[PDB]
Subunit: 213 residues, 3 copies
């Protein structure tokens, strides 16, 4: 299948996993500022657009780390081989959003073909989930482009066993020499530590700072 | 009455409303910095005081948007025609707070008469709710004037169907050329999207930037 | 014993206490930036290290205020005479953390002897709680040294009657003339108001700004 059954008895965080999944169920959010000065220059010298690039770069970082691709399936801890981004789409006419997903690809050009195509087919589709059920192997990416925020947190009544990372971006802004993007990351404590979140962000910063292709 | 029964079957966010009210109950908070450089100048050239002005400006923005005045009454979704601010009051002697409310008025001078009068009557009243029950048509405004914060979030055990926006301000501070006020907004996802929150903040920023009268 | 039964009927926040402990159970988090320019200079001129100093200074501020040392014991509200820090320890080999605690002492040198000794004994102990049960009189201190954050919030499924403050620090960073440390404080509303949190932070800032000995 497109996942592997994870070895829970020989894993180093096995005590942690049960602690934060059942004894003390919890998660955490942290918002950090990502330096997008270099990425703006690269976007500038290409035909790619900001949102799709951020989706692609977020999914790329997510797909490099096992702990951000965890889930429970048939009462077992699995690791997705790969995850596809589920992102929000604003409808300026209705002032409502839809949530769309498209296959992740390592090739940035193929990713762009996927995004545009799905963006093509459901552009004016105001259902909350135009495509139907959300793929099991997903990551959530949202965007708040109209306002800059220093912090964002989702207060959820019931989060038992939902391990997919929640990522939210705000409007970027010039802070002296740098163009900074606020990025909120919300994770479940059973599968992720502060280290795992820092790693992802640091990795995401690297990617912003590198050639697109 | 002072409210209108909202048309839920012909509303564009009807799927959203049920999704986030029952399938996935949740809310979110975001803290943004409001530029109060212009407002400080206007306060300077008047006799008005900062807290009352912020209460008045917050209630004014809130009263312009339907989605921030929503509630459930007799198991139905209503929109308040208008809402009155319920704000916190610090008692320096006891080191405790009370929560007071006063009628909103479009006329800033009449608002000030209301605030001073209620502030007059319950100045030394250390009950948590001096006035009695909190009016159904309300908004919550709190202030933390002793410390600046980049983020604030209320972790509530049970928030089912409480749709009134929660607004919290921190101590303002000079960030170069600007006087910035941290403002945390906490809302329920059933009635508000990220767009609706951005709109409010952008509108609030406009108001700070305009004549008081 | 090492605690005193608190006088709930003659306390000024008694209505507040029941309100936020049972009628409206909730807490809040706030992240503020602590100016550590002065502390860096003092660390520089000594042999002490940053994490241990921050633990010591956090526990010192906490031990000055009753409301941050509250608990329920045998269904009664107690105040700990004193609390010991429980802090996280990263294991670079396994990439997992443990939580350790050591006795608080007013003497900074004795504190350092305690920390090093416990750090000595369980350096390579990868259990989540190497020492066993966590002392009842504790405070939680965590650190995220790999990334800077503007906000941090723990989303906990069940927090009834746990009154110990949760403090989390991020990687510090140069913001012009200042070295700023992000510090998230998470508290239960029954025992702490915004005032009580501001007071702690202001007190913590003072301590950073003062001689170590
Ligand atoms: O609800 C969704 N997204 C919103 C958009 O504002 C938000 O990002 C969110 C994501 C996950 C979530 N959860 O899993 O509890 C709650 C809200 C998607 Cl699942 Cl459609
Ligand atoms: O509790 C109140 N205010 C506090 C003050 O610190 C805070 O602003 C708050 C507001 C709303 C709330 N809620 O609705 O769950 C909880 C806390 C008012 Cl309802 Cl009196
Ligand atoms: O879980 C713990 N610490 C984590 C570390 O990331 C976090 O600081 C935390 C603290 C308290 C908590 N709680 O009491 O619900 C939850 C998480 C300690 Cl109790 Cl070991
Ligand atoms: Co279990
Ligand atoms: Co792979
Ligand atoms: Co329903
Ligand atoms: Co009107
Ligand atoms: Co009770
Ligand atoms: Co003492």
């Amino acid at each position: 299948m497109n996942y592997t059954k994870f070895d829970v008895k020989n894993w180093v965080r096995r005590e942690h996993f049960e602690f934060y999944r059942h004894r003390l169920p919890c998660g955490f959010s942290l918002t950090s500022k990502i330096d997008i000065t270099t990425l703006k220059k690269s976007l500038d010298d290409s035909a790619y657009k900001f949102y799709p690039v951020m989706i692609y770069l977020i999914a790329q970082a997510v797909n490099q780390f096992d702990e951000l691709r965890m889930a429970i399936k048939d009462d077992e801890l699995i690791v997705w081989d790969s995850v596809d981004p589920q992102f929000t789409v604003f409808h300026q006419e209705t002032e409502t959003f839809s949530a769309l997903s498209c296959p992740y690809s390592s090739d940035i050009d193929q990713f762009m073909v996927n995004y545009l195509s799905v963006m093509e087919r459901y552009k004016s589709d105001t259902k909350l989930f135009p495509q139907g059920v959300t793929p099991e192997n997903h990551l959530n990416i949202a965007a708040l482009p109209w306002v800059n925020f220093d912090s964002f947190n989702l207060n959820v009544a019931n989060f038992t066993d939902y391990f997919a990372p929640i990522i939210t971006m705000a409007k970027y802004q010039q802070e002296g020499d740098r163009l900074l993007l606020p990025l909120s990351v919300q994770v479940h404590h059973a599968v992720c530590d502060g280290f795992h979140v820092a790693r992802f962000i640091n990795r995401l910063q690297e990617l912003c700072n590198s050639k697109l292709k």
